Design a protein around this nucleic acid. Structure first.
Lengths: 59, 309, 37, 178, 52, 148
RNA sequence: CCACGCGCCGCGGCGAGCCCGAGGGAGCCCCCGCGGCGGAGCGAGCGCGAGACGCCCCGGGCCCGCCAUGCCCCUGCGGGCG
């Protein structure tokens, strides 16, 4: 939050609602697998990279 | 160890000779092309322009105030003594002090002629070089040709060992070349045909006027003859004496050991299919599925993959 | 065998999802209710 | 416009293929790469890059250095990516199995007389492609005369010899003579 | 312009701000000779000793 | 080859790699290594220590053959011994008929002791020997002898 | 542009070696063919003169010369050992 205030002129910020998070994760969400932008179209890709963290599915 | 066949003038197998070690030498196109390029430059004749060319006339700059360019001008006012001036010296005149000849180490020159000889014994390289060898019965071709002094005798021997189509490819190929080469005493171009190598036999008179046929002695095998155009693969008609003495010429190099044979692409492929490498090979993890993005909310089937419920 | 593992894993993620989607939905609804109470 | 000039620091040049016109060196590099792709053994990852190296990067390894290096491990097959050379200084060479890109004739005779086997990279691929019972050895890269003169001579902490004859007092006879 | 320091800090931070390298921190340059002789004497005994 | 040279890739570029602000000009910094103590002083200091000045005694004529001092290390003395003879000499050890090497015949006037010598006693003949040469040879059982 | 000299890089041959020098050989691209350069350095010179490690790289340690210094002793402003 101290770093964000230095860059305030360049950015806009706010607390996101769960529906806003869902729409970003579903409609615009793309993974970073092997430094590639891989579209998140299934719960399998999330399981593959985040099963260690217990983030098996999109929910 | 393989033994090559020796054919008679009639074209029938007469006797067998063991294969010389030179043919086993690794085929190095890169070395044969490097040695070919430097040796052909050595044969070059020096050219240059005259030192006095374009500096014989008397020209000094007119200078400023005359409304003319400052280049040196003759008494008439005609531009002179400049690259851009008609009747003027070259900016950098061609000079005879150029190093026309390049240098090759004896080992590298010997390596190139050994590799060119090995390419001659490879049937594929000879056909690829454009020689017609389908009729020829064995590569390398060794013939017990006695002293042939008549072209007609030589033609008969070459018809009976299958080299006739190559001799006719070169006879029917004689044409006036293109360019100013004609005016420069290089008017006609013919194809290159078989190379006769001979030892202790007078075969030169018989094959000398045959078209495209070139002759060489076993003591002085020439690379430019062995690899025409830097391309190795010469159809070589060896006499029985010449082939027999090839292993004696290689001994005559006081301290030269023929390069040691190496694997081929086919050998590398066979090893890559051998059981030992296959046993070492481990199967890879299955790849990732990229799948182009679709709106999840667009259809219930799309939504189900991200949200099953 | 890899295809069999992939089919088995896919079901486990789908099952986790059919349960989590409902568990998490209660958490979001409860959060609104808890602040209100 | 995207800002790709921040935490990103350019690209590096690593030779991924051998510049060697020799057909043999290309044949082995492609083979060792095929083994590396199918089995990612790190011995093969290095060998693939040791065949792509330059002559200067690939220094000579004598049969004297190889004897010292394999002193505790006679059974292991030395794998050298350059030329193995004889050392007339070492009167007796021990039996050793060495695989190289080339062995000098004097070296090859000595290893065979010792009872050791001079292997070749093709032979190594056929017997031990992954590199079992094999040590990847290297000669001293900074042994070249060119490497000794690299640097700025005449700088106080340089400690490097000047390239020419020079033969004068100023700058040479100590820090004060500058 | 007699003098400008503009752009100088952009050039310095383009591929610079580089650390002084290791073996500079543990260099014996400027260390007391008597300490350095003691170090060599101590090192030349048993496991640390590197002579035959 | 002219065809593979970079100059033939600068056609159409005008200055030809020499710069618009300052183009190629005839001898801009002067001819040869001039300005060594003045404007090129920085280069001579940074890369040429000892270029300027006089260092030591001057011999009006050096006798090259008189100052020719070829040298041999104790490690290479046994290589002069041919391989067929070398193995037999080494195996038999021997002091009654030890191998005898005259390094002067092989072209070396002084023996030095860079490496190590095999245990076989060997008689070495030279015009001069180092201190280590004598010590290592004597320890092996060999004799350092002078040669006329 | 070419010649020549220097620096660096890549590649080919060979390897503690390497080398179409001039030349010679009935001999043209073939064969034979010295210096030189490298393999030892350092010191004004007199002169003296390297092993201890070490995949590599670097750093340390040690050894050689130059420069001191302390002992010991031979064949002695000489040798050795620090």
């Amino acid at each position: 939050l101290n770093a964000l205030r230095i860059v305030d002129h360049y950015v806009t910020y706010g607390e996101p609602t769960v529906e806003t998070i869902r729409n970003l994760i579903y409609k615009r969400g793309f993974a970073k697998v092997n430094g590639q932008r891989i579209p998140i179209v299934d719960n399998n890709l999330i399981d593959e990279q985040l099963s260690k963290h217990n983030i098996l599915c999109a929910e | 160890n393989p033994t090559v066949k020796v054919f008679g003038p009639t074209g029938t197998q007469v006797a067998e000779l063991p294969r010389p070690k030179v043919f086993n030498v690794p085929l190095r196109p890169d070395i044969i092309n490097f040695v070919h390029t430097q040796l052909r430059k050595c044969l070059r004749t020096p050219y240059a322009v005259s030192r006095y060319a374009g500096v014989q006339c008397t020209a000094h700059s007119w200078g400023p105030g005359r409304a003319v360019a400052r280049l040196p001008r003759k008494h008439g006012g005609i531009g002179a003594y400049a690259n851009f001036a008609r009747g003027g010296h070259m900016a950098h005149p061609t000079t005879v002090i150029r190093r026309w000849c390049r240098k090759v180490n004896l080992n590298q020159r010997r390596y190139a002629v050994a590799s060119a000889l090995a390419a001659s014994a490879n049937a594929a390289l000879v056909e690829a070089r454009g020689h017609r060898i389908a009729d020829v019965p064995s590569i390398p071709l060794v013939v017990d040709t006695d002293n042939v002094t008549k072209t007609k005798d030589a033609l008969a021997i070459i018809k009976a060992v299958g080299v006739l189509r190559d001799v006719e490819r070169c006879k029917d190929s004689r044409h006036i070349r293109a360019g100013r080469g004609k005016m420069r005493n290089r008017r006609y171009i013919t194809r290159k045909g078989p190379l006769v190598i001979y030892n202790t036999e007078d075969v030169a008179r018989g094959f000398r006027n045959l078209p495209g046929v070139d002759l060489c002695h076993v003591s002085s095998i020439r690379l430019l003859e062995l690899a025409p155009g830097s391309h190795p693969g010469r159809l070589i008609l060896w006499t029985k004496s010449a082939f027999a003495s090839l292993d004696d010429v290689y001994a005559a190099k006081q301290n030269y050991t023929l390069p040691r044979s190496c694997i081929t692409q086919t050998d590398i492929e066979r090893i890559l299919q051998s059981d030992a490498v296959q046993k070492t090979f481990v199967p890879k993890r299955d790849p990732l599925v990229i799948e182009r993005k679709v709106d999840p909310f667009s259809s219930k089937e799309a939504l189900a993959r991200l949200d099953p419920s | 065998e890899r295809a069999t593992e992939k089919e088995k894993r896919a079901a486990l993620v789908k099952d986790h999802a059919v349960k989590s989607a409902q568990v998490y939905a209660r958490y979001y609804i409860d959060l609104v209710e808890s602040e209100k109470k | 416009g995207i800002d790709l000039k921040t935490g990103i620091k350019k690209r590096k040049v690593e030779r991924k293929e051998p510049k060697s016109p020799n057909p043999y060196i290309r044949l082995l590099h492609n083979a060792f790469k095929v083994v590396y792709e199918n089995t990612g053994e790190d011995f093969t990852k290095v060998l693939t890059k040791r065949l792509c190296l330059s002559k200067t990067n690939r220094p000579v390894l004598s049969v004297s250095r190889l004897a010292h290096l394999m002193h505790k491990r006679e059974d292991k097959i030395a794998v050298v990516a350059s030329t193995v050379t004889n050392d007339e200084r070492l009167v007796t060479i021990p039996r050793m199995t060495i695989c190289a890109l080339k062995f000098s004739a004097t070296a090859r005779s000595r290893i065979e007389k010792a009872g050791g086997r001079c292997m070749s990279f093709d032979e190594l691929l056929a017997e031990k492609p992954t590199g079992d019972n094999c040590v990847l050895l290297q000669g001293r890269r900074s042994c070249r005369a060119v490497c000794k003169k690299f640097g700025s001579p005449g700088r106080p902490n340089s400690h490097v010899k000047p390239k020419g004859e020079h033969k004068g007092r100023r700058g040479a006879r100590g820090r004060h003579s500058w | 312009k007699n003098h400008t320091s503009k752009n100088q800090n952009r050039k310095d931070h383009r591929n610079g701000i580089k650390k002084p390298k290791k073996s500079a921190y543990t260099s014996h340059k400027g260390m007391c000779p008597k300490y350095l002789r003691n170090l060599r004497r101590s090192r030349a005994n048993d496991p640390r000793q590197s002579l035959r | 080859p002219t065809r593979i040279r970079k100059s033939r890739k600068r056609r159409g570029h005008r200055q030809m790699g020499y710069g618009r602000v300052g183009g190629h000009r005839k001898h801009p910094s002067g001819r040869g290594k001039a300005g060594g103590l003045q404007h090129k002083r920085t280069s001579f200091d940074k890369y040429h220590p000892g270029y300027f000045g006089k260092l030591g005694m001057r011999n009006y004529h050096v006798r090259r053959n008189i100052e020719y001092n070829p040298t041999i290390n104790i490690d290479k003395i046994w290589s002069l011994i041919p391989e067929e003879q070398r193995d037999g000499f080494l195996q038999r050890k021997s002091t009654t008929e030890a191998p005898v090497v005259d390094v002067t015949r092989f072209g070396f006037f002084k023996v030095l002791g860079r490496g190590s010598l095999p245990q076989c006693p060997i008689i070495i003949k030279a015009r001069y020997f180092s201190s280590d040469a004598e010590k290592k040879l004597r320890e092996v059982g060999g004799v350092p002898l002078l040669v006329p």
